[PDB]
A paper describes a structure:
In this context, the plant caseinolytic protease (Clp) complex plays an important role in degradation of accumulated and misfolded proteins in chloroplasts wherein the chaperones aid in ATP-dependent unfolding of protein substrates to be degraded by the associated protease machinery. The structured, mature forms of AtClpC1/C2/D consist of three distinct domains such as a short N-terminal domain (NTD) and two ATPase domains, a feature very similar to bacterial ClpC proteins. The N-terminal domain of ClpC1 is known to perform the regulatory function of substrate recognition, either directly or indirectly through the adaptor proteins ClpS1/ClpF for which it becomes a binding platform161718, whereas no adaptor proteins have so far been reported for ClpD. Here we report and analyse the crystal structures of AtClpC1 residues 94 to 238 and AtClpD residues 79 to 233 (hereafter mentioned as AtClpC1 NTD and AtClpD NTD respectively) that correspond to the ClpC NTD of eubacteria.
The 1.20 Å structure showed AtClpC1 N-terminal domain (residues 94–238) to be a α-helical domain, having 66% helical content and made up of eight tightly packed α-helices: α1 (E100-L116), α2 (T123-E133), α3 (I137-M145), α4 (L149-I160), α5 (P175-L191), α6 (S198-E208), α7 (V212-L220) and α8 (P224-N238). The two central helices: α2 and α6 which are rich in the hydrophobic residues Leu and Ile contribute significantly to the packing. The fold of AtClpC1 NTD contains two repeats of a 4-helix motif that share 46% sequence identity and 84.1% similarity in a region of 63-residue overlap. A 14-residue long loop between α4 and α5 connects the two repeats. The two halves that stay in close proximity are related by a pseudo two-fold axis of symmetry. Strong sequence identity and conservation of secondary structure between the two halves suggest the possibility of an early evolutionary gene duplication event that could have resulted in this repeated motif, as has been predicted for the N-terminal domain of bacterial ClpA and other ClpC proteins. A query to the DALI database and PDBeFold server with AtClpC1 NTD structure coordinates yielded NTD of mycobacterial ClpC1 and other Gram-positive bacterial ClpC as the most similar structures. A comparison of the crystal structures of MtClpC1-CymA complex and AtClpC1 shows the CymA-interacting residues to be conserved. Phe95, Phe173, Lys178 and Glu182 of AtClpC1 occupy the same position as the residues involved in MtClpC1 NTD interaction with CymA. So we presume CymA would bind readily to AtClpC1 NTD as well.
Numbering used by the authors: 94 to 241
Write the structure that this text describes.
C-alpha cells in the first residue's frame, strides 16, 4: 500500500506523475517511472543512468513515439498501471535483497529492469541500452557507497 518508500523514491514517483501530465496522460506506467528515475538527478538510479548515457530528452522522445499524447484531461487520481504496480512489488524485493526495508531510487530501477517487459523496456532497447549492464552498474555503485 505504498508505505515502504524513502523520500527520494517518492520524489521519483512525483516526477513520474509530472511526466505523465507533461504528455497529457493520467497514469503512471513503467515508462513514466523510467523518466522520473532519469530526471530525479541526484540518486543512485539517476547517477547510473547518466553514466550510461541514458539522457532524459532522448528517453522522452522515445516514450512519446510509443504512447503519444493524451487528452490533457487531468484527474486528481493518477493511478499506477498494472505493470507499474508489478515494478513496485519487484522494487521491494530488490530493496530487501540489498538489506533495506524501504525502497530507494536504486530499488525502483532494479525492479523496473526485472519486470523487463513493457514500455520502459522498449524505450531502453530503442536507446541502445543493455538492462543487464544497468543492473550490474547499480549494484556496483551501491557496494562502492557502503562505508556511508
Amino acid at each position: 500500500m505504498f508505505e515502504r518508500f524513502t523520500e527520494k523514491a517518492i520524489k521519483v514517483i512525483m516526477l513520474a506523475q509530472e511526466e505523465a501530465r507533461r504528455l497529457g496522460h493520467n497514469f503512471v506506467g513503467t515508462e513514466q517511472i523510467l523518466l522520473g528515475l532519469i530526471g530525479e538527478g541526484t540518486g543512485i538510479a539517476a547517477k547510473v543512468l547518466k553514466s550510461m548515457g541514458i539522457n532524459l530528452k532522448d528517453a522522452r522522445v522515445e516514450v512519446e513515439k510509443i504512447i503519444g499524447r493524451g487528452s490533457g484531461f487531468v484527474a486528481v487520481e493518477i493511478p499506477f498501471t498494472p505493470r507499474a504496480k508489478r515494478v513496485l512489488e519487484l522494487s521491494l524485493e530488490e530493496a530487501r535483497q540489498l538489506g533495506h526495508n524501504y525502497i530507494g531510487s536504486e530499488h525502483l530501477l532494479l525492479g523496473l529492469l526485472r519486470e523487463g517487459e513493457g514500455v520502459a523496456a522498449r524505450v531502453l532497447e530503442n536507446l541502445g541500452a543493455d538492462p543487464s549492464n544497468i543492473r550490474t552498474q547499480v549494484i556496483r555503485m551501491v557496494g562502492e557507497n557502503l562505508e556511508h
